[PDB]
């Protein structure tokens, strides 16, 4: 069994292996259009001998981490092993060669959604962000006394399809990732794809409509079998005003009972209403998974809290080295060392951490990441803490 | 129609109150026993002329917070207001009486468990913990090489009947509720009933176990209806290890499909396992909600983080005065000032910072708090942190 | 297989068919009440041969029919066949022997609750009352600015004890029987019965409450299952001011999101709210089944509308005669005669005009009763109709 | 804010605000062709400045009121309010100028279907038709032996495709709409619309069939996704051969285990059964929904019971004027009066009682309407009432 990048015959079998192995393929369309972020040698096959029996890839992301710093990002992706093949050791070759590419890449991070929440951890992906979704029964719904945008004049939002706007999208998104750590840069394809599926499907999805505000927007249909229920697709803003604007648009939907949207954990809207109870987490789910490729770029490129005094560690990483670590100033340096590790834990325990998802607190507590210093635990919680809470851009 | 403490002949009258109002009413010899709780004048009637149409009392609570403080707490409880006189004043007159009688007898906090998301919030009261339940599919459930307590001998939790180990059950709970914030003292009373409601009811609830350990207890029962379902309803642990013993002990119930426990959103549980997405996030609600009776001695009696550096401000609560508050070295200063207001909100969103339970920037962000300057926002969030992360003890 | 009346020792016997032929019997206790209610000679057995494989009695009613009349009413109850006898005659044999009992002891009308629908047209039943269940979300629940009772003052409803006001129910029940058609006298017993009901089982249903008023009561408990319905049991008003008072007390139930109740089609209840809809019909079902036994005592028994004007015509009853029927102010004469009939019907089909129900013209449309003149339906439509609703008092 | 008639221009985002505001909208093309039935100066537009934020129009259709008798009816229809203008004023804005059109051109009448039972009351509209959802379990349905049509020979319905019969259909929805209260003229365009709406739709509404009858018709197809449920769209019969001879065939579809229809209280099937109880009540709501716009011109128009004899009183509507209203041989005269007032309801009510499908008592228990007269309620009863019964023709 050879190991092996795709020439273009290979493709029609990949897609056929990709159509009987996810739950709901995309189609080779639409992936055709995402292949344009692969770059050359992004992929491999494994080919039985000669049909293709295993593949996986990676795309070429932005992404944004605290203090608003992007990194470059190796998206993996469109990674199956055939059903006739399992347990023949086919996705840790897969997994180990792309790696092996990405780091002689110069990636300082890999990323990717979960298929389940068991496969990834020990080839040293983390969970790094956090899925919410909020229920809200809007028949009861009223906004509080402080929320913004409530005066007595006209109305700052004002629905509409969403392709004769695509600019104002485009502009409004562009700033959001920009500022949010687990932003990520949104090319034009990726535009394409998105309008195309806001478009209603015979037996499908049905239409999507717009809220636009100058400062941001939200894309929302009703549900396919309950009539009753508005699902949020997505919802961009960069101010206050906006959230509430947009918010006060959705509650104003008379002919729902309930609106829905994949969300994070610190999402205002809950304080924004009378009753926070209202607001009801219906789902829960990790979301970007993290692997840092190479442990002192990671670290160095991020800001870091200016809130914690300056301090200086030791910490292993299991198989990515030893390093002395000093934060001060909202800023890391990160250096070889073999002095004694003050602090130990698996790679992807340190992906956890990297976007403040995670507390370091909370991981010691599970035995995920080992010191025997409480003060070292209270500042590593409080150095990786986010002034801008970690949200997920879109799944790929 | 007149208010005022009830008498020995008034209690039938609001028993049969309750027993109409409530959704389940724990029952006259049950609420006997929580009544030996409420202080003399700490109870308060509203008498149709003559038969009760409204009540409501305040019990003597500790309640730990953040740097392991214990303030005196007046917990309310046992209200209501008759079907028959809805709409006339009487929670208001109620809430308002014993709010006088609070302050007056040196209260610096009040707290409640909210029947309803909707009502406290006008009465100064924010919800200041959060109850995350888990449901834990076992079957699937593998502890990850980290995970505490699994090298290769005896085991250290033990299995047994709650009533034969009642010592150990108040003694590990004492342990936990003086160190965690959130924590409450369960007087002897209270562990009499909870080890009442330990017992099988004939078409009831069935019987409990408890698991216990040295630094840690587990109590559990089958569900009444779904015999495939564990329901946990108190597990209290001072050390990881215990916490991690008690969930190997729980993951081997191997007559059960699944294992709930209402617990709170750092919970270390997900993170002990291989599949973080096995701890399923199931259901998700404010717990302890908080009055600050007392600004100027309830900031000044919490302990703050040590991260965040010496800095001052002024806050304005909304009708509960303006102060100059300045934070350094882990203790607040709060004085009276006359001085322009850097920071201002109303009285329920000091109870919600209280505890570290929601952040200051969230907050801001749906313009329940507002302030012009960020880094005083960062500063706040970093203040108001708590080490230990915030807990619900028990319901009342 | 002989049949007879039963002595003393055949009731064992008896209780043991009814316990396991019952959906749910009621059990000895309770029907040994009930059988008070049961004249010397009212009930038969069929023995095998010996143990009892068939049973029916009547209990001696007291019947409201239209204009106030009350007439002496045999209600059949009690009926079983063995599994192990079916399809040999047996009910057919009881019903038979039951009906020469009641008609030889001057009963001018029979009356039961039908188990199945299909079963008790032949014997000359015909169902006369209407049984509408509403349930009402009482969460968006708000009475229009026209209903009774909601001034600045006091409220005129209690909430107490069922068993505490016991002669306050009997006398508001009793002024209510003799004014609806379909009221039935509650003799002491039953309410001994119907008050022992009102007490929490364990294991069963939840402890009874009573919200009264001088002119109407109204019975409820919640659900067993869903805790936030509460289900009455009974709600009987004699003023309108009474009706729209206790719905105001019921719709205070903060409690619960639902209300449902077991009433008829001319409820007020949805007319009192601000949107009709919440009212809503989940079941509907015929109530109390009609035998008329002498055609022409009940006919001329029975008060009509004053509105037709005076009106004669020939009424042959399929085996029960032909008469002359005239009526006018009120009242009718019914006479045998052998002139040409102008209307014909099923003796079920009086049973179900009887109480005024059901249409004439709505009966003719299902050709269930025969004539040639449209104008006939009409009078007759009017003169059958009830200045007061029918209504269904209590099961048997 | 600015309110006007359309243009055609205003079209495209009328649509738009149509599309984003209903549960499911019918679409642009359907849209179109009732817009035919819309008169100019019909239709009203509220812009925001310049988007449109809100509309409102009425079709101008024939309504058949008791006694035969066809008025010139106003059909509110296609009514919205942008999500982002609620709360703004703009509803009664455009239905007050809307009323003042209808009244000023001539109708006699308004009328609409209500998207919620709370929003049109205050607007003066009543609801004046009820809708039944029978569904039958024909597994065991068995006609009556009185039944008509089950003699011994052919079928007298034949099984058709609807669009082949369309003439048919037509003339003898014609017949029907005219000799019954509630009955619409349905243009040439609507029945385009309805036979479109026969044929299957990929991933939509399966085909419909059609029972014909020379003096009835019923159009149905098999539900979505319960395939063992048959939905009846529409029955329509002049005679009760062609009823029961209809449902006889549709009794007679073996494959299906149910048949559910949306009909009126006094259909006669549940008499056409030996079991009545099988034509079970599964869903009841308001169906057309009245507003009387000129009181003496709508009383006069409609005709009224003979039974009643002739009688005199004074009714006041609550901004609508007090008339002497004179009733007699069938005829209304109703002229102004200052004379004072017998009887006392708000506009809405007397829209309920027009058609006959509420009575005057049952109103009078809510307080809807005010009288110190109970033998004048038992007249207005008795008067108001229709010989045929009262039924709902198309939504709209
Ligand atoms: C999981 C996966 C790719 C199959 O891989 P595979 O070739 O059977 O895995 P390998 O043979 O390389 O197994 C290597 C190790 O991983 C483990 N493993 C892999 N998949 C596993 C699974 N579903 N359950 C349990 N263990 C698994 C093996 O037990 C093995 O353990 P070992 O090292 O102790 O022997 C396949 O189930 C799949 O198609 N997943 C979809 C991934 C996805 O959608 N990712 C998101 C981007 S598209
Ligand atoms: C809510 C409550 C006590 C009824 O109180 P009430 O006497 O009707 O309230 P009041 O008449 O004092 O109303 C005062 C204000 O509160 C508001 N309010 C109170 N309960 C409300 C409810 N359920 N919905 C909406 N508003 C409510 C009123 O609108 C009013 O507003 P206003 O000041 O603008 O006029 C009752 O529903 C109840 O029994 N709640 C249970 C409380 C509980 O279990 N607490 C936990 C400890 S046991
Ligand atoms: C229905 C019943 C009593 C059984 O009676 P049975 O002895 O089998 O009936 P018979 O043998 O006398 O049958 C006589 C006729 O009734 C019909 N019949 C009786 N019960 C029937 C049923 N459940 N289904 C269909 N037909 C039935 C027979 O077909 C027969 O028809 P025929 O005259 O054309 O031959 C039995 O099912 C029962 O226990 N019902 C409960 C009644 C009840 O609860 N009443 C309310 C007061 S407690
Ligand atoms: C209801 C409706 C049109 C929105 O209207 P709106 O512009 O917000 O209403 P207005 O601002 O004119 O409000 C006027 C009054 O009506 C009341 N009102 C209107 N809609 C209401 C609703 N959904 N709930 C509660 N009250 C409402 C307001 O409280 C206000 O009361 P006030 O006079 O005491 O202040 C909107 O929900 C809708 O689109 N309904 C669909 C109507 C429909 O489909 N009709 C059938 C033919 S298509
Ligand atoms: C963008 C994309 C794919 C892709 C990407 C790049 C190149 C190519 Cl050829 C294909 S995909 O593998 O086809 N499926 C895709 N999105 C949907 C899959 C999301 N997963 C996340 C993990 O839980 C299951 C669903
Ligand atoms: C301890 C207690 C009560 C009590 C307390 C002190 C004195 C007396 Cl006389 C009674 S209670 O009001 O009867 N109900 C109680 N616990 C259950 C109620 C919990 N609520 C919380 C809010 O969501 C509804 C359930
Ligand atoms: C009052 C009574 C009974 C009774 C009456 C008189 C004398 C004796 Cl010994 C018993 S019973 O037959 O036991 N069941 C009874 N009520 C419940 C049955 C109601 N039926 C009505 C039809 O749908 C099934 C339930
Ligand atoms: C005929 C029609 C519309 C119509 C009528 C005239 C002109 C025009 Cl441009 C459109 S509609 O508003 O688009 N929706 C319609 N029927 C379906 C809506 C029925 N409502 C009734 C109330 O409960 C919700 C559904």
Redesign the interface.
Known sequence: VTLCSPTEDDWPGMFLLAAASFTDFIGPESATAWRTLVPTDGAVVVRDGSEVVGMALYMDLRLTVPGEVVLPTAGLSFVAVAPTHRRRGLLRAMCAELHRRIADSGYPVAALHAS???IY?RFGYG?ATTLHELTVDR??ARF?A???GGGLG??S?????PTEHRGEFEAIYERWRQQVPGGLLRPQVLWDELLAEAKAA???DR?S?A?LHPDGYALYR?DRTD??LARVSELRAVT?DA??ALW????????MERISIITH??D??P??L?????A??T????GLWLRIMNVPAALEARGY?????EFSTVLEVSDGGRFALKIGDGRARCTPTDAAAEIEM?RDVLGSLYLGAH?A????????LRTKDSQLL??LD?AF?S?V?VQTAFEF
Chains 1, 2, 3, 4 share one sequence.
């Not at 006060?248 to 002919?255: E, P, Y």
């Not at 789902?283 to 990790?286: A, E, K, V």
């Not at 607190?361 to 995920?368: E, I, V």
């Open positions: 389940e929440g068991g951890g969970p028949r009861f509080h402080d929320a913004p006209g109305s939002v004002r629905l509409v399809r015979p037996g499908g239409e409509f809220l009703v009539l009753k206050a959230h509430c006060r648009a959705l509650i104003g939907l008379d002919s954990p610190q205002p809207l304080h924004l009378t009753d926070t109870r209202l009801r987490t789902w829960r789910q990790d809290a200016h809130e914690v005094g698996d507390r607190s909370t991981l010691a507590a599970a035995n995920r209270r500042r409080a803490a002034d809470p």
